[PDB]
């Protein structure tokens, strides 16, 4: 098969990202995969004359202890051309959506020769016993934003016979994964996904066929979705029958901040109860005019803000906060104070022991949700020190993609998203 010409965005060179250290498990697992991929022509050995590099690490195969090979093509995707030469709004409505790893198809299509040098990565050595063993891809690499677009002409041909016989099944693709939504239940959705697994096999598309693990963690449950039951976490005011002047100060501050999102929130009647200079622990009864204002504020906070629509020309931003006792709250937005979704997570892996294991699970959860609702990956504002995150996050990663993220340190003045 011929090769599609691939170029970079105008005025930008290739990626030059240093390789981070890897454990012995992953180094032994990466050299075993790279040799099998070099004997099969998928990758070819190179040297220091290639001035580009991108980080490579290892994750776990689905429902298995065998190691996988994952490349962090984030900086390369930012520099490759925009492949242009539709997102299903009903995918987020299906009773069930299953994710299928179809990245094996990419290892069959040869890659543009004048582009393979931008795909270089380096394998390190324990204690630097050996210098860097470099390679480059000859085929479409998994996790590269150009692979699904180049293969989009081929996949649409494969799925069209299946989509005809099943015209009520949405199929959306993002990177190496297929998002198959259906309205079936009582085992019917499970059987139809295996029909698609048999269809892809007849065209030569291998998919993970391992039996779902019965021992925790049930990581395979992350690939089984039910978007029709997803809820939003609204701003909630404290519910009390007796208030101290300290409770009302907290309440006024939370309302003053909430007014930046909801314009109809008023404070006058509640702040009128803090006119004197009384002790913080003193109970004050509420006037009939203040209770009416609190009721009208609760009524406003029931429904999300209107007049906020998704803009495909803009990027998505995801902010996450740690609430404690395994609780995490998040908001997705394109413009400030105009959230498209507010959610909450709880009872995640490491809820009793590991904050980093919780945060990585939440980041993958939010990203999977944003892929189903809008077809984009958000840019994350992670509440963690930079060195803490980069030390540990690869040990808990499971997706074939990696979203962009930055780090923040915003102490909680008020607890807005969780009361």
């Amino acid at each position, epitope marked *: 098969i011929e090769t599609v010409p691939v170029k970079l965005k105008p005025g930008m060179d290739g990626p030059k990202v240093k390789q981070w250290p890897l454990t012995e498990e992953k180094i032994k697992a990466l050299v075993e995969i790279c040799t099998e991929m070099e004997k099969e022509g998928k990758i070819s050995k190179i040297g220091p004359e290639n001035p580009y590099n991108t980080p490579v690490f290892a994750i776990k195969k689905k429902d298995s202890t065998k190691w996988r090979k994952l490349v962090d093509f984030r900086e390369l995707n930012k520099r490759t051309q925009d492949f242009w030469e539709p997102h299903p709004a009903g995918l987020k409505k299906k009773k069930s959506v299953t994710v299928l790893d179809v990245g094996d198809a990419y290892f069959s299509v040869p890659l543009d020769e004048d582009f393979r040098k931008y795909t270089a990565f380096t394998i390190p050595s324990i204690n630097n016993e050996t210098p860097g063993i470099r390679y480059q891809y000859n085929v479409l690499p998994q996790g590269w934003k150009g692979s699904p677009a180049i293969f989009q002409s081929s996949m649409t041909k494969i799925l069209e016979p299946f989509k005809k016989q099943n015209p009520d099944i949405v199929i959306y693709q993002y990177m190496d994964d297929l998002y198959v939504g259906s309205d079936l*239940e*009582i*085992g019917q*959705h*499970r059987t139809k996904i295996e029909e698609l697994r048999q269809h892809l096999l007849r065209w030569g598309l291998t998919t993970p066929d391992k*039996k*779902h693990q*019965k*021992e*925790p*963690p*049930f*990581l395979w*449950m*992350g690939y*089984e979705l039910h978007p029709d039951k997803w809820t939003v976490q609204p701003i909630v005011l404290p519910e009390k029958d007796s208030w101290t002047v300290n409770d009302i100060q907290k309440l006024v501050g939370k309302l003053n901040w909430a007014s930046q999102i909801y314009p109809g929130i008023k404070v006058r009647q509640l702040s009128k109860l803090l006119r004197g200079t009384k002790a913080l622990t003193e109970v004050i009864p509420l006037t009939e005019e203040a209770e009416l204002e609190l009721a009208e504020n609760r009524e406003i906070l029931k429904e999300p803000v209107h007049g906020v629509y998704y803009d495909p020309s803009k990027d998505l931003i995801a902010e996450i906060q740690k609430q404690g006792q395994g609780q995490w709250t998040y908001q997705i937005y394109q413009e400030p104070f105009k959230n498209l979704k507010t959610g909450k997570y709880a*009872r*995640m*892996r490491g*809820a*009793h*022991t590991n904050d980093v294991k919780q945060l990585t*699970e939440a980041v993958q959860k939010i990203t999977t949700e944003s892929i189903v609702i809008w077809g984009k990956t958000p840019k994350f504002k992670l509440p963690i020190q930079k060195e803490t995150w980069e030390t540990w996050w690869t040990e808990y990663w499971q997706a074939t993609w990696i979203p962009e993220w930055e780090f923040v340190n915003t102490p909680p003045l008020v607890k807005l998203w969780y009361q």
Partner: antibody
Amino acid sequence: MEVQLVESGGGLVQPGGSLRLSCAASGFSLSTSGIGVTWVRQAPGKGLEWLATIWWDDDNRYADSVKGRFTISADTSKNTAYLQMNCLTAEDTAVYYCAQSAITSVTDSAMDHWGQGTLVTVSS
Amino acid sequence: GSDIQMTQSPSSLSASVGDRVTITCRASQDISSYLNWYQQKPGKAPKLLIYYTSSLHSGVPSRFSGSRSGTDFTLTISSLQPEDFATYYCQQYSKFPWTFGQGTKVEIK
């Protein structure tokens, strides 16, 4: 319909005899992905002992106390579960419950909606 | 011999209404946080009380709590009630075969 599990088939059995217990499931289908049934016995006055678990994909998990003797099955047509207990001894005299096993999330899996329990006694 | 062993302590205890009761259950190997607690009142079938170490099952009052310190799991009852006098079993599911604790009986005295 609420979730219900009703065991049946217990009774007195002679040494070296066998017995099949039924667990009729109402309120949920055994064909549902992530759903399984689980058998647990409790000798009179003693504690709970886990026995077997069949899952939605015909996957079976047995205890060492019953390996080679007990066989767990499921008929999705009648939406009931079975436990064929061969080679019974007096150490198998107990009340036998069937419970609903379900992998509900990445982290949650337990036993809920326990049946009333049927009694099995072995002579000696 | 590779089966995981769940050991509860104590095997029985006596408390009056309003007391605070703690029941521990130690696992013979690391089972992460994958533990379920069960309540079995006399003559009745077991009820799922707590799942995944600390999550209360639907319908369970706020006096019940579950915690974990490595392999030392703890079920606590802040204000013992007449409805709470039962036998409590811990159960692991980190690995098959699943195993139960020997049980802790909470009596009145």
